Amino acid sequence: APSFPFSRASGPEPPAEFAKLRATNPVSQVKLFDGSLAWLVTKHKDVCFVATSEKLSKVRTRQGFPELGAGGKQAAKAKPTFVDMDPPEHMHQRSMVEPTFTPEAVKNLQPYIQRTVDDLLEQMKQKGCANGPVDLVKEFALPVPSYIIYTLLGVPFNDLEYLTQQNAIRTNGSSTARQASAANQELLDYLAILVEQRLVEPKDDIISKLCTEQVKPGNIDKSDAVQIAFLLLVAGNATMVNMIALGVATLAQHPDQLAQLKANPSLAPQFVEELCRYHTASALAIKRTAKEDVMIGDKLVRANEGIIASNQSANRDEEVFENPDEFNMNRKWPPQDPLGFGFGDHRCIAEHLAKAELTTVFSTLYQKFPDLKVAVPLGKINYTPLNRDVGIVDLPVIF
Ligand SMILES: Nc1ncnc2c1ncn2[C@@H]1O[C@H](COP(=O)(O)OP(=O)(O)OC[C@H]2O[C@@H]([n+]3cccc(C(=O)O)c3)[C@H](O)[C@@H]2O)[C@@H](O)[C@H]1O
Ligand code: HEM
């Protein structure tokens, strides 16, 4: 069994291992950091099965859960929320915050998403780049999703640097156990204060609804509200930042497609679809354990063994997406769903929100800055460590 997770082949590419596995060993065992063996699923059909099987559990502290690092064990000590639940507990709590993320709710949020993007881009225009390139991440990719979720949750914009820093320390593989633990607690303490404020004086935000609709009536306690707020604050935000940055790098890498997008910003939706398939910025989150013996592919997975379903590999499945390793926003989509946002009950609660933010970004960015260019050779882009999910730390640009 090979050590897992695997490292990306190069900055923007997925691990080279997946291709061989899909072709000759689709469901296999891998060796985790603690010496335990877990099952790696690489084919689209199998990942979909894993995401929908009633025989598998999402419970993180359940016996056999496949933590990928020593830090995982500590994170798992967090109070369980819907992301760690199976039916009926799952939807019982997820339904408490789902209203904000429905297709209808996201559609009504469009004017605000547009304004948020418009304002951030205008500031870049005013700051200019006469004295050199600016970091698209810090000035745009970072504040776009951050400001939106902060408004939805009820978090003050001024705390962007602090909250971003603390979560970075918490999830950074280079952080000592102590440093990561302190960071996680600073995040909870911060949100506890906010939840307490809303219990006394509610506003029209997610935290407030949790308070008036669930806490006061005694359906969940104060600590549950804090954990839910924590989950919505930390899950996916950094991933959105990376997706925006990766989208810009991809367009610079595919000049012909950028030309099409500039000529017609209405192509943004299809660009976003290919982006979410090609760059699977969340590739190690679909993890489960078998409640009982069950067949996954042609392999018998025994009760309590861990499973890791790679939606990244599924998105590069050559038996589903033609010429999978080529980025082409003009591809004709097959009947099979791309899995950038997962599948089944746990499919990203913010899928509609995320795609709207990305669609707004890519239908506006080049209209605002038609001459936007990545200011460093593409081969020199500062990507995230190869042993982690694909992303970009900073992206110098001119316009
Ligand atoms: N207190 C602590 N002490 C030591 N290490 C700590 C830590 N807290 C986090 N960490 C480390 O950093 C990682 C932090 O992640 P942890 O909180 O599980 O996960 P992360 O914040 O990504 O996500 C929180 C929850 O959302 C889920 N999710 C699904 C799909 C996409 C995304 C997304 O963010 O795009 C998130 C995810 O599986 C998890 O259940 C851990 O795996 C751990 O190694
Ligand atoms: C483009 C950026 C994003 C990508 C690619 C993404 C991807 C995913 C994937 C693949 C899952 C499934 C995990 C599993 O099945 O185990 C997931 C779950 C989830 N995501 Fe996202 N996500 C993104 C942004 C967000 C944002 C911005 C939020 C914040 C509101 C978010 C909140 C969640 C939550 C709460 C869950 C767990 C839902 C559940 O268990 O029912 N995601 N996401």
Report the CATH number that the domain containing residue 102 is assigned in CATH.
1.10.630.10
Measured from the alpha carbon of residue 340, the closest ligand is 2
Q: Which of 180, 28, 84, 137 is nearest to 393 (CA)?
A: 137
Q: Which one of 348, 359, 363, 364 is the catalytic residue? A: 348
* Residue 348 marked in a binding site: yes
Helix (H, G, I), strand (E, B) or coil at 56: strand
Q: Residue 220 gets which letter from DSSP?
A: S
User: Is 84 part of the annotated catalytic residue set?
Assistant: no
Ligand nearest to the CA of 188: 1
Return d(Cα 5, Cα 40) in angstroms, integer.
Answer: 10
- Nearest ligand 2 atom to the CA of 288 is 16
Which candidate, 256, 277, 279, 262, places its Cα nearest to that of 381? 279
What ligand is nearest to the CA atom of residue 234? 1
Query: For a substitution probing ligand 1, which of 47, 62, 171, 239 has the most ligand atoms within 8 Å of its CB?
Result: 171
Helix (H, G, I), strand (E, B) or coil at 294: strand
What CA–CA distance (Å, rounded) separates 237 from 217?
Answer: 30
Residues 302, 294: Cα–Cα separation, whole Å: 6
Query: CA 3 to CA 305: how far, in whole Å?
Result: 17
Question: Which tokens in the block code for residue 153?
Answer: 């949750």
Q: Number of structural domains, the chain?
A: 1
DSSP state of 305: -
**348 among known catalytic residues:** yes
Report the candidate in 160, 355, 388 with the shortest Cα–Cα distance to residue 284.
388
- Measured distance CA(329)–CA(335) in Å, rounded: 16
Residue whose pair of structure tokens reads 């870049």 in the numeric block: 124
307, 41 contact by CB (below 8 A): yes
Ligand 2 pocket check for 141: Cβ under 6 Å: no
Q: Is the CB of 226 under 6 A from ligand 2?
A: no
DSSP state of 3: B
CA distances to 156, 253, 267, 277, 326 from 274, rounded to whole Å, are 33, 14, 11, 5, 10
Q: Per this entry, what is the length of the chain?
A: 399
Report how far residue 204's alpha carbon sits from residue 207's, in angstroms, rounded to the nearest whole number: 8
**Beta carbon of 355 within 6 Å of any ligand 2 atom:** no
Residue nearest to atom 40 of ligand 1 (CA): 83
| Centroid of ligand 2 to alpha carbon of 239 (angstroms) | 9
The conformation of residue 214, written as its DSSP 8-state character, comes to I
Rounded to the nearest whole angstrom, what is the distance from the C-alpha of residue 64 to the centroid of ligand 2? 23
* Residues facing 296 on adjacent strands: 299
- Residue 77 CA, closest ligand 1 atom number: 1
Taking the CA of residue 98 as centre, how many other CA atoms within 13 Å lie in the half-sphere pointing to its CB?
13
Instruction: Tell whether ligand 1 has an atom less than 6 A from the beta carbon of residue 78.
Output: no
276 is catalytic: no
Question: In whole angstroms, what is the distance from residue 100 CA to residue 105 CA?
Answer: 6
CA distance 152 to 349: 14
- Angle, alpha carbons 341-362-374 (nearest 5°): 105
Question: Does the C-beta of 236 come closer than 6 Å to ligand 1?
Answer: yes
CB 67 within 8 A of CB 35: no
Residue with tokens 């089944």: 344
- 360: annotated active-site residue: no
**Phi and psi at residue 29, to the nearest 5°:** -90, 145
Which among 365, 363, 362, 338 is positioned nearest to 351, based on CA atoms? 338
CA-nearest of 309, 280, 305, 231 to 388 is 280
Supply the DSSP symbol for 365. H
Q: Whose CA is nearest to atom 19 of ligand 2?
A: 348
Sign for the CA dihedral angle at 45, 51, 52, 56 comes to positive
Q: Which residue among 100, 116, 239, 280 is the active-site one?
A: 239
Resolution in A: 1.8
* Residue 306, strand partner residues: 289
- Measured CA angle at 272 (ends 113, 344), to 5 deg: 95
Query: What does the angle CA 316 – CA 2 – CA 178 come to, to the nearest 5 degrees?
Result: 95
Q: Residue 100, SS3?
A: helix
Range(s) of the domain holding residue 21: 1-399
Q: Which atom of ligand 2 lies at the shortest distance from residue 90's CA? A: 41
